[PDB]
Structure formats: structure tokens, C-alpha cells
Amino acid sequence: MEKKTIVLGVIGSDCHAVGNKILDHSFTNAGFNVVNIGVLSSQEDFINAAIETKADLICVSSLYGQGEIDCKGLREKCDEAGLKGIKLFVGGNIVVGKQNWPDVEQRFKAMGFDRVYPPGTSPETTIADMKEVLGVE
């Protein structure tokens, strides 16, 4: 519930000249276990890194570099049910497009067990990482 295993990949909370801050409210945040999963999103190799964290909040700020394969890879990590991380947060996802976004996650977000980060993340997004992923918002 009050899980302390947040793992972030690819881009993320660093601040890629967002012009806000550094985005130090996702790193430690609640002083929980801060671990990096790595680039790409490769859920299979990150299953071995799930032994490490065993992240409840599996986030990858992968701009479709994960692909719809590895997107459906984390659906299989949930549908694994062996390893937790039923709640994912799909950072980036596509590019600039929220209001009337693609048919990609129109159907994949139909289930949308995960949330999505805007094309210009803020910690308002990770306010929701730690919110909905504790259990509910």
C-alpha cells in the first residue's frame, strides 16, 4: 500500500530544460527506495531488475521506444501476477498529444491500468505517481 519501490527508466525526473526546477519530488520523494531500471523499457530484463526493486510503480519515460510490444510486456508483468507492479506509469508514451491523442492507447488506455505523463512533465504528474500507485487517488 505504502510501498517504497519506485523504479524509473529512460528519461524522467531530471528536468530536460523544462524551466520549472530540477524535479526533485520523484527521486527520493517520500524517502523510499529510489532505483533506476534503465533505458528502453525491456520488461523482461527489467523483470530481473524487478528482483532488485520489485517495483510497485514501474515507470519508463519511453516515448514509444518501448513499443506496443513492451507496452503489452508490462501488461504481461501484471498478468504475471507473480511479480507486482500492476500499476505502471507510461512516461512520454507518444509525443505532443493529450487532447485527442492517438488510437495507440485509445484502446491500450481503454484498460489504462497505467497513467501517462504529459509531453512536458512536472512533479504534478509524479504527485499522481505516488498518489494512485499507493493504491488509489
Swiss-Prot record:
Its cofactor is adenosylcob(III)alamin. It is an enzyme of class 5 (isomerase). The keyword Metal-binding applies. Its EC number is 5.4.99.1. InterPro entries: Cobalamin-bd, Cobalamin-bd_sf, GlmS. Pathway: Amino-acid degradation; L-glutamate degradation via mesaconate pathway; acetate and pyruvate from L-glutamate: step 1/4. Residues 3-137 form the B12-binding domain. The keyword Nuclease does not apply. PROSITE patterns: B12_BINDING (PS51332). Adenosylcob(III)alamin binds at S13, D14, C15, H16, A17, S61, S62, L63, N93, I94, V95, V96, G97. CDD domains: Glm_B12_BD (cd02072). NCBIfam families: MthylAspMutase, PRK02261.1. Belongs to the methylaspartate mutase GlmS subunit family. HAMAP family: Me_Asp_mutase_S (MF_00526). Catalyzes the carbon skeleton rearrangement of L-glutamate to L-threo-3-methylaspartate ((2S,3S)-3-methylaspartate). This is Glutamate mutase sigma subunit. It comes from Clostridium tetanomorphum. The lineage of its organism: Bacteria, Bacillati, Bacillota, Clostridia, Eubacteriales. The gene is glmS.
